[PDB]
């Protein structure tokens, strides 16, 4: 049967636990990303010389 | 002074994700919006699981 789940906010950063133990909002990798409270995942602000 | 009390039903037709409803008023009369509500036809092809 067709099933569907959505992850409202990718705000959990990364987790090093097995995938069966992770929260839906935690990923595996997140490099140069910003976890905003109201804008979700963003690129980190650019490095200004 | 013309003051109304009750419910005003108006058509909001189409996809809920693409319907912007806003209330404008620039008159000298008061407004007291108690609440609102909507009805629509909802269907999902998959279960919440």
């Amino acid at each position: 049967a067709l099933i569907s789940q959505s992850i409202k906010n990718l705000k959990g950063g990364i987790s090093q636990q097995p995938d069966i133990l992770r929260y839906p909002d935690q990923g595996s990798r997140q490099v140069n990303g910003w976890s905003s409270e109201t804008e979700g995942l963003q690129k980190r602000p650019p490095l200004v010389f | 002074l013309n003051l109304g009390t009750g419910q005003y039903r108006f058509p909001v037709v189409g996809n809920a994700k693409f319907n912007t409803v806003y209330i404008l008023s620039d008159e000298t009369t008061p407004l007291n919006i108690i609440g609102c509500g909507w009805e629509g036809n909802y269907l999902r092809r998959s279960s919440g699981i």
């Binding site: 789940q5 636990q17 992770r22 929260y23 839906p24 909002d25 | 279960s47 919440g48 699981i49």
Partner: peptide, 15 residues
Amino acid sequence: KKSLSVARSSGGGIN
């Protein structure tokens, strides 16, 4: 009428 997604406040950290 297909079932709805269960409202999960969920959490964070180690589980």
